C-alpha cells in the first residue's frame, strides 16, 4: 500500500488498522544514548512528543 | 492520518481493523485453439 498502515495476525487472517499522526511541532530527541547502569544501553534513541 | 512516511507518527492500535486473507487458487488458464477453416479456392479474373 502507498499509505503507511499497521497490520497484525489474527488467527489465520491479517487484521489491518488505520494510522494517526502526532504533533510534528513538539518533538524532542535525546542526544545521549547511554542508559542508566551499564551494558543495558538503548539500541535506538528515545523520542518525546505530544498527540 | 497516513499521508506519507515523512511525518512522525505512532500507530499501534488494533481493535476493529479490517480482515484479509491470502488467496492461493488463482492460476493462468491455458490458451485456446483455432478452428482454422480451410478448403479449395479458385480465382477468376
Amino acid at each position: 500500500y502507498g499509505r503507511p498502515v499497521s497490520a497484525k495476525f489474527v488467527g489465520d487472517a491479517i487484521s489491518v488498522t488505520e494510522c494517526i499522526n502526532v504533533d510534528q511541532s513538539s518533538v524532542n530527541i535525546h542526544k545521549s544514548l547511554r542508559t542508566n547502569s551499564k551494558d543495558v544501553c538503548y539500541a535506538r534513541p528515545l523520542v518525546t512528543f505530544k498527540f | 492520518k497516513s499521508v506519507d512516511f515523512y511525518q512522525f507518527r505512532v500507530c499501534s492500535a488494533s481493535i476493529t481493523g479490517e480482515l484479509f486473507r491470502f488467496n492461493l487458487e488463482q492460476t493462468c488458464p491455458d490458451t485456446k485453439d483455432k478452428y482454422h477453416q480451410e478448403g479449395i479456392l479458385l480465382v477468376y479474373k
Partner: nanobody, 116 residues
C-alpha cells in the same frame, strides 16, 4: 466546556473490587487523555494512571501496576476503572481529569468517595 460526570459514593468490603465509571461530554474522546487521581482525607494528590483511547494505551504508575484496570468506550465515551485487592487505606476521593490543548489537568470531576 467539557463536563465530566462521576458515579456516586459506594461502600465495599475490604478485599473486594470497586468499579468507578466516568462519563465525558462533548463529541468524542478524540486525542484527549483521561487520567485517574486519588486524594486521601488530609493528604495530597496521588497519580493512579492514564488512558489514551485514540491508540488505546494505558499508562500505569510503578506502584499501582497489576492492580488497577482501565478501560474506555468511545461509543459512550465512558472510562471504567476497576480496583482489586484493596486495603484499608483505599478510603479516598477519586477524580477523573481530561487532557486539554493547554495543561493536562485542565478538566476535573465531581469526585467519588470510596470507603473501606
Amino acid at each position: 466546556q467539557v463536563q465530566l460526570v462521576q458515579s456516586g459514593a459506594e461502600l465495599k468490603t475490604p478485599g473486594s473490587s470497586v468499579k468507578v465509571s466516568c462519563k465525558a461530554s462533548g463529541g468524542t474522546f478524540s486525542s484527549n487523555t483521561v487520567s485517574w487521581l486519588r486524594q486521601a482525607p488530609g493528604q495530597g494528590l496521588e497519580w493512579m494512571g492514564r488512558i489514551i483511547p485514540i491508540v488505546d494505551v494505558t499508562n500505569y504508575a510503578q506502584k499501582f501496576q497489576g492492580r488497577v484496570k482501565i478501560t474506555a468506550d468511545k461509543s459512550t465515551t465512558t472510562a471504567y476503572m476497576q480496583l482489586s485487592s484493596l486495603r484499608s487505606e483505599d478510603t479516598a476521593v477519586y477524580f477523573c481529569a481530561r487532557d486539554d490543548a493547554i495543561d493536562p489537568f485542565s478538566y476535573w470531576g465531581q469526585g467519588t468517595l470510596v470507603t473501606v
